[PDB]
UniProtKB/Swiss-Prot annotation:
Function, in words: The SMN complex catalyzes the assembly of small nuclear ribonucleoproteins (snRNPs), the building blocks of the spliceosome, and thereby plays an important role in the splicing of cellular pre-mRNAs. Most spliceosomal snRNPs contain a common set of Sm proteins SNRPB, SNRPD1, SNRPD2, SNRPD3, SNRPE, SNRPF and SNRPG that assemble in a heptameric protein ring on the Sm site of the small nuclear RNA to form the core snRNP (Sm core).
Organism listed in the record: Homo sapiens (Human)
Positions of the UniProt region annotated as Interaction with U4 snRNA: 11-13
Protein's name in the database: Gem-associated protein 5
Gene: GEMIN5
Site for Interaction with U4 snRNA, residues: 31, 253, 303, 327, 349, 390, 394, 438, 517, 540
Effect recorded for residue 665 to E: In NEDCAM; uncertain significance
Phenotype when changing residue 12 to A: Abolishes interaction with U4 snRNA. No effect on interaction with the isolated 7-methylguanosine cap that is normally part of RNA molecules. No effect on interaction with 80S ribosomes
Result after altering residue 621 to A: Abolishes interaction with the isolated 7-methylguanosine cap that is normally part of RNA molecules
Effect of mutating residue 71 to P: In NEDCAM; uncertain significance
Effect of mutating residue 602 to A: Abolishes interaction with the isolated 7-methylguanosine cap that is normally part of RNA molecules
Full-sequence range covered: 3 to 723 of 1508
Outcome recorded upon mutating residue 390 to E: Abolishes interaction with U4 snRNA
Amino acid sequence: QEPRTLPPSPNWYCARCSDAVPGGLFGFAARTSVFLVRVGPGAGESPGTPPFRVIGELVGHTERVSGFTFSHHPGQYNLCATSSDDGTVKIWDVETKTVVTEHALHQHTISTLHWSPRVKDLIVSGDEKGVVFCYWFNRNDSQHLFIEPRTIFCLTCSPHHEDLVAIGYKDGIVVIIDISKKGEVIHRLRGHDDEIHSIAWCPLPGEGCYLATGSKDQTIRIWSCSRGRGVMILKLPFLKRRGGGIDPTVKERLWLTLHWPSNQPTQLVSSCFGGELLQWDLTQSRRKYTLFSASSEGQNHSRIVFNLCPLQTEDDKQLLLSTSMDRDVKCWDIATLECSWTLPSLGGFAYSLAFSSVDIGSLAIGVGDGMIRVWNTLSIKNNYDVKNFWQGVKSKVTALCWHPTKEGCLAFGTDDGKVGLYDTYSNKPPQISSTYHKKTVYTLAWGPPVPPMSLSLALYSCGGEGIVLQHNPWKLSGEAFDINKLIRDTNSIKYKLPVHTEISWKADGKIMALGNEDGSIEIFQIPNLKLICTIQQHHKLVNTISWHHEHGSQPELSYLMASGSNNAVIYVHNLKTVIESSPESPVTITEPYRTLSGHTAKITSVAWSPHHDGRLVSASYDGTAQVWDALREEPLCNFRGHQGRLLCVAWSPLDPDCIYSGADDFCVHKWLTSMQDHSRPPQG
C-alpha cells in the first residue's frame, strides 16, 4: 500500500552526523547522502504502527558525509548543513532537496559542523588539523580561526551566547572560544585524557554557564564557566551485557555521546558501554542513573551509540533518536524510556533477495556487510521487522535461496566461495560446505539429486570460476560433486566444458538451465543431465535466468524462460517444442521467442510476476528496474528510485503492484508500479 526504504547505515565515529527538528523531521548521514525521516502525526501512519516514514535524500556529496546539523531557527527548520570528505560544507533546503550554497574553504578532512542556535546563518566547522571556519552563508562572509594544532572531534556553539563555541579534541582538550575575538580561548577545561565525543551546554543560562563533556575516557564531566573548572565527574557504570550474543570477533571501544534535555535541566542522557542509554539525575550529584529499556528485554542497542537527537512531535510526545554501530536507528519515548520503534539499515550492497514459499512474505536479503537479513514483510504492526543472522557468515552474502518446503531452511553463498545452510527457526550456527568455490557464489538453487548423489532435494551452487557443485543438504561437510563429470559422461563430450555462470531449475524439477560465460544457455533433462538444447542468443556472460511459474491462465507459460546478460537486451525463449519432443541429439535455438529492449546496461536479475501471465521485472546496471508485458514486448513501468546499480529484484508475494529491488547504493526499496511516472528506462 505504501513504499518503504531499507536505507544505508548511519555513519560511524562522527560526533554529529544526525539531527532533528520539531514536528518533526530526523536527518542522518549515511555513506555519501543524508536520509530524511518524517516522525509523528505528519508521517500519516495507522494507530499502533510506528509513526515514521523515510521520505527523502540529500544527494550531491561525492564522499562520506561526516557532519549534519539542522537550523533550529523558527521559520527555517527546513535549512540544514553537511560536511564531507569531498572537502565541502553545503547548505541545503530540505523542501526542495537542493543546495542553497556551499564552500570549499577547508584543506584538511573535516571533522564536524554545527549551526549556531543564536545566529540565523552562522555554520561553524572544524577539521583534522584544527582549522575552524565560521561561515555566515546568507551574507557571503567567512572567517578562519586556529586555536590549537590538534585534531578536532566535536564542536558545539552555545545556545545562550552568539560568540561562544566549545571545541573538543582527539587528545581530551576542551576549550571555549570567542569567535568575535579571533577565537581567543576564554576557558580551557582540563580533565579528560582521551577523545572528546560530545559537548552539550546546559540549556538554561547561569549557574556564567554549565557545559557537559563526554569522552572515550569513560567519564562525563560537568564544567562551570564562572569557575572555569570541573564541578562533577561521572564515571560510566559497568552493567551486564543484554540481548542476543553479538559477534565476539568485532573490536569496539566506547563512544560516549550526550543529550541535555531543554525540558528537564536536572537530567542528562548519555550513551554507555555496549550502546546502553542512561538517564542521569544531576540532583543526586551519588552517580544515580536510570537505564533505558530496563524492563523490556532485547530492545536496547547491542553496540555503541554515536548520536542522540531529541524530537518533540506536533502532538507533544518527547522522543529521542539514537544511531548505533549495530546499524539500527531507535526512537525512544522519554516519558517511559522504552523503545517506540526501530529502523534497521544496511552496511553493504544488497546482492540478493529471496521470498520464502513456506512462510509468505519472509524476505531474505544477502548483504555485503556479512549479515543475512530476514525481513518479515507482512508484519502487521511493524513496516521494518528485520532479524539479523551473523554466525558463520563473515563475508559478503552474494546468493541466497530458501528451501521450497522446509520451514526456516535458508541456503547462502559468499564472495569467498563459501556455501552454508541456516536454520533460521533456531539459534544454532549454520552448516558449512567443506567444498568451497574458487570464486564468488553467484547462484544457489534446489533441485532433484543427480548421479552420483544418493540423498528430497539437492542444493546446487554456481561459482564465478564456472563450476556448479551438487551438495547434500543433510551432509554438507561431506562430498560435493562437480556436475561437469556427469554432463561430460552423459553427453560424450570431448572438448572442455563451458564456464557456467548461472543455474536455474524449471519449476517442475525436470529441466536444469545453465547460463555460461560465452553467453550460451544449455538445457538439460533429468535424470542424467542429457543435453537437449543450446540457446545461442546472448553473446556475453549470462547473469540471470528465470522460468515462468506454473499457476498462470495457460499451461504453455511454464515453458517460458527469461534471461539476462552483460548486454542490455533481454530475451525470452519458449522451450515447449524441444522439451516435449525429448530429442536424441541436442537442438540449437538462435532466434528469440520475445525480445525486451530498453535498458542501457547489464541485466543482473529478472523475475516473473506470480500474479500475472507473462509479466517480467528486470534489474539493471542502468540504475532502473523495468516491468514488462513480455508476451507483448511492451515496457510498462520504470522505477528510478535507486541511486546505484541494481543487483536483485523480487515481486511481492501478495501485492501485484509491489516489487522489491536491491542495489549497490546499500538500499532495498519496496515500490509500487502504480506510483511510478515513467514507462521505460532512460534512453541516455
